Structure 1
Amino acid sequence: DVYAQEKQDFVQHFSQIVRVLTEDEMGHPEIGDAIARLKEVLEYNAIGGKYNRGLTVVVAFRELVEPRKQDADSLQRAWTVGWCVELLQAFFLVADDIMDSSLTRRGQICWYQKPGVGLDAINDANLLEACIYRLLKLYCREQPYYLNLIELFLQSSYQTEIGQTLDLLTAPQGNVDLVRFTEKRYKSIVKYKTAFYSFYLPIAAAMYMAGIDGEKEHANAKKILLEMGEFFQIQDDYLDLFGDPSVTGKIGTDIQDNKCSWLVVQCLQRATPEQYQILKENYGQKEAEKVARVKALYEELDLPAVFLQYEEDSYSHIMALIEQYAAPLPPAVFLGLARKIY
């Protein structure tokens, strides 16, 4: 991977990200205990994932900038901005896991379930978000793209938070209501809640760092990348239930949780009224056999075939979008991502 090549250097820069977010305030003995807590919060929640989003900033910056302008300090800013994208994500997850009452995240105890944390994790989460703008100011304050990146991350938060409201409205806990689970609503939630920050954000950020700041160039990249984000999430919903779980590690609780999955959406538009009932009675419940009987209704409806059909169509749609909207960015910016996700 062009990712495994830059990965080491990405994770190693984290030590410096942290030093700087705790050292810059060495003039204030008074708040040392809060800054220690902050460190623990950064270490527990920004570390442990694959870093795909943050790393995309770095890879894209390398492909976008003329190599004579990749001086040591330019790269340091790319690593730093990649970590900003990872902290934005760590803010969202720490807060989501509290809202979902999740137990674990990456098979580790969620931060809010640790002894002594509880709902204080709400402030911790907000602190992760604040670190983003601290780092931008520390590293990028003099740069012509400074304001551009501030606005991009604030817009990234807002889109995500809007998509979270939409999700929450669409799939309450303690409420089966499949009338909400439409195709338009599904695409909407995906686009606002995950595709903007997961896919648009990191390429956009490298684009601004590269001086590529035109509205049209960004609109064009966004068209391709929101489309990829849509596919990524649909594949996430398919795997949840059909992914061989040793190939994931996770085990899908989508159905138990009344999630607006891609599966239940397709299911609903493909179902005589007797089918509705079996779903209306088994969706969003805890026991194995009532969750086995939904997996059975999906298998019975060749939704795995439907997915494979969707994955094929989607891949040629994305490639046509690259052909049509990538220029004047090197198509490889988008092709590297397409390769990771297909």
Structure 2
Amino acid sequence: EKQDFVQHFSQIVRVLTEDEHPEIGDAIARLKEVLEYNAIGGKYNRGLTVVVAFRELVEPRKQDADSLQRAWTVGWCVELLQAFFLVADDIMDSSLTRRGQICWYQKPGVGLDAINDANLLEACIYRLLKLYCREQPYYLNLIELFLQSSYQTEIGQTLDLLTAPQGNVDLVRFTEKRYKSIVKYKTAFYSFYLPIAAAMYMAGIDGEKEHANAKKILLEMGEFFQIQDDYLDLFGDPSVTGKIGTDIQDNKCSWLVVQCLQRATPEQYQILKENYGQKEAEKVARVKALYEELDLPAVFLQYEEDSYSHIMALIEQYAAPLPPAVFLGLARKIYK
């Protein structure tokens, strides 16, 4: 399934680049480069979720060649949206690598031009929806879903960045309540709600209450996914994660620091105060050592188990009348 999804990318790049209007040539070329470098090399889970859910929600007699093409394309739209956000997120977080290669903006000859490049990736979403879904009943529902999920992700990023001012001790700000708001908005809407909801609209499941019920499950899964992202920022294997962690030196409201603040002794609070939020390797190591001294890996592992049980309880409550398998396949993939 992931090999089939990735094979459809050649076709996407081909239709996005067919406007070559020789004049715009050299920017179409650059657009190819941005797409090749930036939407390829991930696991493709968010885009595949659209396709998997589409096949589970749509009656097989309605799954002809062209409706399947529209599903693959919408899944690539979700991946282009993630590519838009990541590019810009790597600039703002001062990140070094992404998916096992240097962040696009560190590429010599790119730099802050990456800002345009990211806006273009966003623009491609709507070009693809027009090329493929324009005459479908769900066209406007999808455009609106993508725009709303962007807005919600940018609100989240705003909070992320206001809670993490550079060069400024922000520990008082780092609370559970605040953390939960950050991750709801910055990650949960676009990573989980968006692709399932997109498949739902394509299948003609438009009801407010069915979308609300699906959202109840999916926003909690997204919360877990971001907690996991925070854990792996520091404790993940960078040959697996494909990215260097910057949360400590970026002064982020990570699940780790939140959990640390609620366990630290007043001596340990001062260690964090003196070392969090700074570029010095030795300072970052003191924080990591405090996390390790507080058995934060053990705490994450227990949370992963408790979170799983909680999400499965919500699937029991809220999945119907959708197939639980939609949610269960997602759970398998993120608690893997």
CA distance in 2, matches of 1:138, 1:252: 38
Q: Deviations over 1:109-161 (max 9, x none)?
A: 22222232222221111111011000001100010000000000000110111
Deviation at 1:246, TM superposition (A): 4.9
1:251 deviates by 4.7
* Cα gap change, 1:256 to 1:273, in 2 (>3 Å): same
CA separation in 1, counterparts of 2:269 and 2:191? Answer: 33
Shift of 1:240: 2.5
- 1:73-99 deviations in Å (ceiling 9; x for gaps): 011000000000010111111111222
Shift of 1:19: 1.0
Is the 2:31–2:117 Cα contact (8 Å) retained in structure 1? yes
**SS of corresponding position for 1:313:** helix
Is the CA contact (8 Å cut-off) linking 2:163 and 2:173 kept in structure 1? yes
Q: CA deviation at 1:291?
A: 2.6
Structure 1 pair 171–73 and aligned structure 2 pair: CA distance change class (3 A)? same
Q: 1:59 to 1:256 in 2, by over 3 A?
A: same
Q: Share of identical aligned residues, percent? A: 100
What is the rounded CA distance, in whole Å, between the counterparts of 1:106 and 1:176 in structure 2?
Answer: 30
- Stretch of structure 1 that moved more, 270-279 or 332-341: 270-279
Q: Quick one: higher RCO (CA 8 Å, sep 6+), 1 or 2?
A: 2
Distance 1:246 1:134, change over 3 A: closer
Mapped to 2, the partners of 1:101 and 1:248 lie a distance apart of 17
1:262/1:173 CA distance change after superposition, 3 Å: same
Matches within 5 A, 1:168-317: 168-317=161-310
**Deviations along 1:154-207, whole A, 9 cap, x unmatched?**
001101111111111000222221111111111111111111100110111001
* Greater mean deviation of Cα atoms: 100-109 or 83-92: 100-109
Q: Matches of 1:204 and 1:132 in 2, distance apart? A: 16
- Tell me which moved more, 85-94 or 254-263: 254-263
Residue 44 of structure 1: how far off its partner (Å)? 1.3
Distance 1:250 1:46 in 2: 15
Quote the offset at 1:236 in angstroms.
1.8
Mapped to 2, the partners of 1:253 and 1:102 lie a distance apart of 7
- Any unmatched runs of 5+ in structure 2? none
* Structure 1, gaps ≥5 residues long: 1-5
Report the counterpart of residue 3 of structure 1 in structure 2. none
Q: Report matched runs for 1:89-104 at 5 Å.
A: 89-104=82-97
TM-fit CA distance, 1:22: 1.5
Partner Cα separation in structure 2 for residue 50 and residue 76 of structure 1: 20
Say whether the 8 Å CA contact 2:87–2:118 is kept in structure 1.
yes
**CA apart distance, 1:262:** 0.4
- How far did residue 244 of structure 1 move? 4.6
User: Could you give the per-residue CA deviations for residues 279-328 of structure 1, whole angstroms, max 9, x where no partner exists?
Assistant: 10111233444333222222222322322222221111101100000001
Aligned residue for 1:44?
37
Which range moved further: 217-226 or 40-49?
40-49
- Quote the Cα distance in structure 1 between the aligned partners of 2:31 and 2:243: 29
Partners of 2:100 and 2:239 within 8 A in 1? no
